[PDB]
Amino acid sequence: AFGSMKVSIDKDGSKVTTVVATPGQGPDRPQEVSYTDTKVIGNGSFGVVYQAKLCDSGELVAIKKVLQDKRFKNRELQIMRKLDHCNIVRLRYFFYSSGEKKDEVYLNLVLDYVPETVYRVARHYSRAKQTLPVIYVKLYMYQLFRSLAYIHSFGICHRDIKPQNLLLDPDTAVLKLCDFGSAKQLVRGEPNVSYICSRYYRAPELIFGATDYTSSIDVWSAGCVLAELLLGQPIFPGDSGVDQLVEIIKVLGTPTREQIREMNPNTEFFPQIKAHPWTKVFRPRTPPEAIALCSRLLEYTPTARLTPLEACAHSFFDELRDPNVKLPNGRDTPALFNFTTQELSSNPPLATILIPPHARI
C-alpha cells in the first residue's frame, strides 16, 4: 500500500526519480533505485508502460504502472516473483506509488527493456517479401519452448503467446517471453475463463469457450508462431471464430466426432472438409522437419500435442545441437543446454537428447 518517491532536478538538469523498491527475486531487501529519461512507450490495457534509464548503470528498463486493487493480491506480480529463467523477461524490482491524485495506488513493475520483438522482425521481413533465415526460426522457437517447459513445470500457463510477446536481443539472439498479465496457474478441477488468448493464436478448444483447458494451449499458440515465421503470415486468420475454424479445418482436416466433443462441451453441431496435405501449405524449399514439428504442435486433441520439452528435443532443432553452429554474425549462440532439474521434471530421460555430447565435456 505505501512508500514514497522523490524528484530531484540534476546539474544538467534532467528529472531524476528515486524510489525505494523491492527486489524481484531475492528476499525483501529494499533498494534505492534512481532513474531518468522517462518516456511513454506503450500503453497497456490496465495502465501504462514507460521506458527509463537507471542513473548509475545507465541500463535502460521498462516500468509497467498498473492500477492496484487494494482489496486483493496481484496475480501478475505473484507469478513474476516465482520465475527465474534466461528466456523469461526479468522483474528487477517492484514498488507501489500513487498515481493519480487519488485514493488509488499504482503497482509499478521494473523490467529488462528489450526493443525488438518477434512481431517486428517477422513483419520487417514480410514487408520486404523475404523469408527469415531458418536459423533464427530455430533459435527463437527453441528458446520459447524452453520458457514454456519452465513455466509449465510450475503449472503456470501464459495464455497469451504471440509474437509481440517474444522479445529479442538483436546481437545475442536471445528471446525473452514477456507479458504475464493473462497467466494463471491451472488447477485441474478449477475452471478458467475462455476469452484469454489473442486472435490468431487461440487453440480450437478456446475458440469454443472450453473452461477445462490445459497448458497445451500455449503449445498450440507456439505452433501458430512457428508456422507464421515459415509462412510470413498468420496461418489461421479470421475476424471471427468461425472464420478461424474454417482455416484450421482447411489444414488439419475435419475433426473427428470425438475430437469435436473434446473441444465443444455441448458434441455438438456446422463446417466439414478433409485433411490437408500439410506440405502443400508452405513455400517449396521449407524444411520437412519444420513442417513435421508444426503438425505435432497443431493437433486438435490437446494431449496429442508435444510438450514444450518434447518440441525442444525435435529433429528441426538438431542444427542448434551442432557444436560448430554459430549465429550469422559469427558470435556463439546463446546458452541452450544449461537445463535445470526443474526444467526437465516433465520428463528427465529427455536430457539424453536435449544435451549434446559436446555440451557435457
Place this chain on the structure above:
Amino acid sequence: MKVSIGSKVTTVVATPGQGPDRPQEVSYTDTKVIGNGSFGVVYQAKLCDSGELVAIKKVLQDKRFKNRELQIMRKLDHCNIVRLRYFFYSSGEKKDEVYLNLVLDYVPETVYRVARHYSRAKQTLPVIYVKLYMYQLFRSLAYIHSFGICHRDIKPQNLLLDPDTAVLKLCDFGSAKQLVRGEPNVSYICSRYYRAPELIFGATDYTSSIDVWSAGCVLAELLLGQPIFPGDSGVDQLVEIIKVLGTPTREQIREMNPNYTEFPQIKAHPWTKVFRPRTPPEAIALCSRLLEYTPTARLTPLEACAHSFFDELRDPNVKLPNGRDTPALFNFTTQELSSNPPLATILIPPHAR
C-alpha cells in the same frame, strides 16, 4: 452450366429466390472475381437479359444437409436486405462436387469502406448519413428478428450502400440462425469489435439482442471515427467495454456465463465524455440504450427505429445532400411491427404514403 459466345456468356437454369420453385434459363456475362470469402468466391456479372449487375456467391455444397444460408435467404423480402434473385447448382471444380451459387443484388459500397475514407481524411461521416444508415439497419434487424432469426455477424463490412440513393442493405447471411428457446447455440459467431459481452464469455443461451449490441457498436464507431471496443483479445475487448460501461454487477456477470464467479473495480465512465464534444446528445443516448450489459435491457430494433435521434428522418422537408428524396423509410409491414405495433404511430409519420 452451359458456356457460350462476344465475349463470354454463361447460361444456367436457375431458380428464383422468391415465390414458386419454377426455374428459368438465365444468362450472364462480364464475369469477374471480386472477392474470396472464407466459404469461397464471390463474382460479379451482368445479366444479358436486363443489363443489371449482380453478385454471384459460390459455396461448396454438401448434399448431406440443406444449406442454411439459402433456407434463410429464401424467406426474406425487405428493402434493407440484399435480395436473392436466383440460385443454382454447378460443379466448377473438377470432381463429383457441387457448388451452390447465390445470385444477389450487386451493391457497390459498404459502410466499412465509407467509414474508412472519412477517417483517413480526418473527418466524420455527417450525422444525416449516420441516421439514414443506422435506421435502415435497425429496420432490417426488426424484420429478421420477427421471424426469430439472428444475423450473428453485424459489422460494417456487412452493410452495403448505394451512394446515390443512400439505401443500405444487410448482407452476409452465412452465420444466421433462427434461434429457438432451450436449444443451445455456438458462441464463436460474431466478429471481433462487435461481439457482445455474453458472447465474449461463450454464453450459448444468448438472444437476438446480440445483433443489437453489434449495431450499437457500429453506431458508436460512426460517431467516433474508430471502433469503440477494440482488442486482439476477449480480455482487451472487455477492459474497453468495462471502461465505458463501468464494472458489471455480480448477476450481470453470472448472466453472461454462469461458471464465472469469477474482475477489476472500474467506475462507470460518463458516456458524455466518450464522444467528440460536437456529438448530438440523442445519438449518445441511443448508444447508451443499445450498449447495455443486460440483454433484455437493450432496445429492440423497433424501439430503436422509434428513437428521438431518428426524428429528422421523419421530417417532411428532409432531403439527401445531393438534393434527392430520401429512400423508403416508412413502408412498414405488419410482420415488421409485430414486436410492438403501437409504435406505428411514431414510425409512420403523417405525410408518409
